[PDB]
């Protein structure tokens, strides 16, 4: 409450089966400017008002296990312009494991899923990265 | 321009999961902060109010406080710009910031999502203070109270420890505690919340008669009013529902009558703020506010201001500890402290209860003589009764 | 103080080790020194051996909390003082012993009991009334134990390294005082 | 559609007490207007005097609402009754109110004056209830009516 | 007076609850170039003449605290095309915190909110930023 | 089935002599976003759904060898819009050397051959590499 | 622990040498101690001669099995409990004779045996039947054999550097308990 926060522990509802996430980015929220002057205003630069909102995609990032094939299982749920879409919940947590920043998304759906590079000389694990697209965000805290 | 402002109201909130028992109450430390548990917050029509008086709210570190525009006199006295010589009303939500607050306040375990609390300066209660809760019970004879009421009795307040089906004469020593004298918040303030529509039931519906209700509220007017017509194939006798709207009503304390009757009261709300805790009601109007409590003087054709200080306070909780293991423990029922009761070999807890505090003074030590950890505020275990009652209340803490 | 927060650490971890290792003979695990001096590493100090060994290896200053307000409110007046200085602290936990696999075994067990407890206050591990210290592990990677251990004298022994995140410091003295708004005239 | 015409013609005064009685139970008349066909007139229930359920569509929607929360809070049984949780349930159901907020359904200028959500222990919960093992949950919705009656009034221009 | 001053001491008024920001950049002026030749000059270069102003966005960032929720709380008052403006002070304290140099911005209001991103391997705190849109920017030194 | 998996122990079925590649890299899958608002929608963003998919072209890179001269070999067996079509299978083994995760590629024909290049400094061995272009993808793991 | 993985690379390793050189004596080939220590490297002890060392050299975290439940489902009851840190462990074989040719054909020998076994466990390699380790070579640069080495003393012997996967640490101790969802009222 008086101490400022860390950022890694954290989880993630997605309508999945397994957790245990590395990285998650893209949330965002923006508006756009719109400007306006007329010919016998005495200062000379602009005025300013708000317009259209905008919002972005969000990436996540795992490791990869043995058995578990569930980011194309929702890729591949896409027909001609259906598909299934889902409920997103993100929250932090502290110490006590109590969700204190929850980040809600509305309809989303996976536009993109890239799967580990392969090299002979590489002393790592193999990672899959999920990218998805939504029509809304909203953010609680306290 | 010249623009005088002057304290005219003082506002304080106490709770002893910080103060803790002081032998005799006076001001509050130094150190003092509920910032992060409490918050006032004024209505729409107190807003307005507020600015036809020209009045400035403020919060502050133990609560809030009001300023008012008054005028710099040669006698000591401070006259407002213009004389407040009407009745007027102000309100203010109470919201709760902290989470597992129900945990550490000894409030009412039983189920109610349709009640609020409510706090007034005309409860009278002025004894070492200016008590916005009602006047605590007294202690009598063959009475029903359950684990956790507090009441007065021999200049003291008494504490429940256990349900009692019939009282004693004299207090009985291992069902109560023995703290100072002091107010509190109790079940005497649990008020039932209502919305805008209600369904009320008229008993013995009669065809040949009219039913005029009406809204009475604290300054004793008239605020609402309708009519209803029992239909005239309706066998005489059987009660009958209606539907109601309060659609245009400000929050607030009210008595709904019918017929010079009082058939129910209730706090009216708006859900402008749906999730608050409590709502504190302010009044000025020189016939129902004592003069202890008041806030004007009226002499001369003018009005001067007399600053106060109201108080509300709130007890603290208390359970019994309970300590449980995950291998066996080697202390026996004669190298234990003497508070102590062995339940099993893994376990054992306190006799008596003990009160939550975040800076307890001294812990309890070991068979062994070592200092154990105090429980946490996550979670508490009631259990209850044969007959549905709640009959003891732990914390349980994990070595 | 910066021993208050160490002895703290200290007594709870042997607490717990002397708890679960009985057969230790109820001597002092756990000490605080530098490591550094040992004389089986090239110091002087012939008394570091058979222990767990605590050092505070560097201090940092929390960027988060600077630009704190320098003034309090209290009855209408104003208290200036100087804001605190709060600091992150990082411990080297060292086990030393003429038998290695004891070393082992103990680090083990200081690398079970930090993951048990998450918070160190006194009203939780009690063994000032003022401290809360929420500890985390540090992993490097060979560059930054070169680094470390060049700054250390440039000898291995089995090990573990902690930041402990909050510890605040200040004077117990006043700045100036003064007084608030009541009254405004314009024009 | 596929109607020559009904059995019996109803006028306005009939439907005066038709529509409104002073028991509530209300009778919906289908009339035939020139030009026109044959048509259904009126919408209410037999709960005519009641402000909440007097129309049809609303108890119908309703009905709808609460069955989809019913099916979208099914899954959580047998779960842990912790703040995890009641967050996941709170992200679905204001999620499927804002959808139905957004195509006309409820009133509001934006969805924080359509509808509210209130679970937890400091809303509709205490501790008693998390050892029972209830999940306690409230929503409210401002709903949408329609106008019944249209005055016309006529008069001569001055001049 | 005789020292140069350094760049770690601040404070910013914004009409927000909580104080403590850890930067602020983008408080800058500037003015557009005209050119002009006629075909006789002797000189084969152009003259340059002054013409409209320009301001820029100002970006803030500072670390998450429980409870706080204050930047989204100034985004979302946002309507078709009205939004809350607010006037902001920015000023710069020297060892005896007395502000020194001042810098007044008119009309702002938040046109982006970026939150942090979580990294199961980030050891560091979590920031949030802010970006803002203004109508005007005054300097005030001594 | 517990442990994540590492990146460094697979095999590749190119209908090809030899085996032992170094690295393989571009496996993907998308699908594109198609946008859509009415004037009257009392929101200001956009409704999104699914469109067309999109696949990526397959990298190879291997070691040189005397006598093995196969990915001229199939690059070379090109007519004027004609070419050898191949079915590829791509696997990662673990520990025991069982087929865990596989992707299987549909219609794949050579695009691009690129040899070594000499430096007479170069302490390194010489690596080749092919790109490959393919009508479908599919992923399975479990 | 630490020291049971170790003990079992032990003796596993022991066991194939000496089943392939029967000149040895049946003396003990693998020890384990710390290769700094040693007399000719300048250190002081002097019983570290004509050996294969076991050493540990560094310790990380898992990064993928972090953020892991902290509950369990048992009964219709919530167990609490902290989850485990999983760790990986670097260790590095050194061969230390007075007879520069034995080095070397000891560690071919260690680096054929790791050829042939790749995963270690008590059901495969007997000699705590909760251990499962699979290793891997690493091969460096000259810049790591300078970092590895000057945090070792400086100066080199025939080694080799292998790192085992997953070890799991945790303490014996819950948390708190809870109750599930069985009932729900809407409006």
Redesign the interface.
Known sequence: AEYPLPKFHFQVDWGGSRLGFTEVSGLDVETEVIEYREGNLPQYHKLKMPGMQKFSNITMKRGTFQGDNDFYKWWNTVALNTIERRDLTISLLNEKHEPVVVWKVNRAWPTKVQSTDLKGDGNEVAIESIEVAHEGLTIQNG | ??????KILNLELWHDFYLGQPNTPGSLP?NYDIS?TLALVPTQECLRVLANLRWVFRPQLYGASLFANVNAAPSGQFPTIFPIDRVYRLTFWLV??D?????FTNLS?????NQIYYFSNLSGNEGHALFLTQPLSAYTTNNEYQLGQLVTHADKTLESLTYQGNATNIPNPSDWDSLPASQYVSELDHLPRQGT?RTQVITNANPDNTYNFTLVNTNEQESWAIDV???D?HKSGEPFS????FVGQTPGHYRLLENDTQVAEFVLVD?SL??A?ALVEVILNPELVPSAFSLLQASAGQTFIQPKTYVIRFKNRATRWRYRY??PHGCSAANLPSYFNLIDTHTYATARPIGLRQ??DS?LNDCQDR????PSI?????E?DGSQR?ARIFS?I?? | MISDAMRLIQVALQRYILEFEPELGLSQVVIIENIAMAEELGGQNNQINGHVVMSLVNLQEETTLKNSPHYRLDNGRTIYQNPPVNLNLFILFSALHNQYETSLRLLSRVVEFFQWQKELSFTTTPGSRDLRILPDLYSLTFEQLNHLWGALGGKQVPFVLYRARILSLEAPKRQAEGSTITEIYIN | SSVIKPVLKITNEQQNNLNVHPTGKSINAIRAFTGKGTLIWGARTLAGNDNEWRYVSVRRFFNMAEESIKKGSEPFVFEPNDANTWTKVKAMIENFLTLQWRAGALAGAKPEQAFYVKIGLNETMTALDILEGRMIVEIGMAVVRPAEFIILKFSHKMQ
Chains 1, 5, 6 share one sequence.
């Not at chain 2, 989470?99 to 945990?103: I, K, L, V």
């Not at chain 2, 375990?109 to 999502?113: A, F």
């Not at chain 2, 200092?371 to 105090?374: E, G």
């Open positions: 321009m010249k623009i005088l402002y002057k130094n992060r709760v910031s989470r597992y607050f129900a945990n375990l039983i189920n109610s999502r529509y017509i029992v239909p194939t209606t539907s109601l709207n859900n749906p999730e805790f995950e291998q800076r307890p812990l200092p154990l950890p105090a996550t979670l508490i275990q009631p209850t709640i349980d994990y070595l």
